[PDB]
Amino acid sequence: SQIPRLSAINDLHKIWPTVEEHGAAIIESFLSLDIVRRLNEEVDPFVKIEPIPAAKTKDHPNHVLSTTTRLVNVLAPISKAYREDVLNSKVLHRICSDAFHVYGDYWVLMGAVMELAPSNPAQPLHRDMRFSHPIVEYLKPDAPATSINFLVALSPFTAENGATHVILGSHKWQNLSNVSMDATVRALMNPGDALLITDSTIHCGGAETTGTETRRLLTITMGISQLTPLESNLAVPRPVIESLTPLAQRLLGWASQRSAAPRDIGLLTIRGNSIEKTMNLKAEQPL
């Protein structure tokens, strides 16, 4: 059984139900080729100057990613396509509101570009969030997923160049005895396609075998606003923040948040008022 593939336009209402059942789905043409081009252009130089994940110069080194991975997060200050087109994706927001309605508001836990050098080895099969949010492991096994991960191809995903592996149905597994590469299928994707998984879906980046292709992706981890993001936008210039939509501002932690509790008292509030009301935060102001 292969990963179900869905149209971002026509099959919109089926995307989250598909992931909820099978643990993965491919959203064909999630981002247009044009958004992909612009995003690639914008992040290019920052990918190039990015050192190894556990570089000695970092005070939060990432010891888990391979030395042949480059990860660049906090994309808003770096990319117009990201902070405008991506953060406002209608497809993304329908899926996220489908997925997280039982909990309340959601935001970006991390939006990162990942680039894999030629001959990058495959990752060990894993679930996300275990190196940042121990709390997730203590949730009841049937609790609705508290984060999901959009893995957006920014270049072709082939079997040959290390397209992602997923184990369909593994988001519901409790006993991990059958975890093996034998159980996986591949996410073959064109640029702009997206693989959508939950935080319980067992998956791994694939082994790059050509020795010449450089595979790149945009990973967008969306999570309930009750969970702390992996990345901070606190240092993003106010002019940039005030160029965004109110929705994009909330996704980046520049607005208060709400839970779904009937008499919700809110998150990140200030003596009963919102961040944005308190700071008189403007929105949609061109730079």
Ligand X SMILES: CN1C(=O)c2ccccc2NC(=O)[C@@]12O[C@H]2c1ccccc1
Distance CA 116, CA 65 (A): 10
Which of 55, 179, 50, 203 lies closest to 130, judged by CA?
Answer: 203
The count of residues interacting with Fe ion (CB under 5 A) is 1
- For the annotated binding site for Fe cation, the residues are 126, 128, 203
Q: Does 128 bind Fe ion (CB under 5 A)?
A: yes
- Asked if residues 227 and 109 have their Cβ atoms less than 8 Å apart, the reply is yes
CB of 141 to ligand X, least distance (A): 19
CB of 197 to ligand X, least distance (A): 10
What residue 155 binds from Fe ion, ligand X, none (CB within 5 to 8 A, per partner kind)?
none
Name the residue nearer to ligand X (CB basis): 126 or 186: 126
- Cα dihedral 185, 189, 193, 194 sign: positive
CB of 95 to ligand X, least distance (A): 17
CB of 284 to ligand X, least distance (A): 29
Applying CB under 6 A, the residues found at the interface with ligand X are: 62, 64-65, 110, 112, 123-124, 126, 128-131, 219, 221
- Asked if residues 127 and 199 have their Cβ atoms less than 8 Å apart, the reply is yes
CB of 268 to ligand X, least distance (A): 23
What residue 79 binds from ligand X, Fe ion, none (CB within 5 to 8 A, per partner kind)?
none
Which residues 6+ apart lie within 8 Å of 251 measured at CB? 87, 106, 107, 108
The DSSP 8-state label assigned to residue 126 in this structure reads B
Instruction: State which residue has the least CB distance to Fe ion.
Output: 128
Pairing, β 106-116 against β 194-198 = unpaired
Piece in contact with Fe ion (CB under 5 A), picked from 16-24, 83-91, 127-135, 186-194: 127-135
Q: Cα separations (Å) of 235 from 52, 121, 225, 232?
A: 22, 34, 19, 7
What residue 112 binds from ligand X, Fe ion, none (CB within 5 to 8 A, per partner kind)?
ligand X
Instruction: State which residue has the least CB distance to ligand X.
Output: 64
Binding site for Fe ion (CB under 5 A): 128
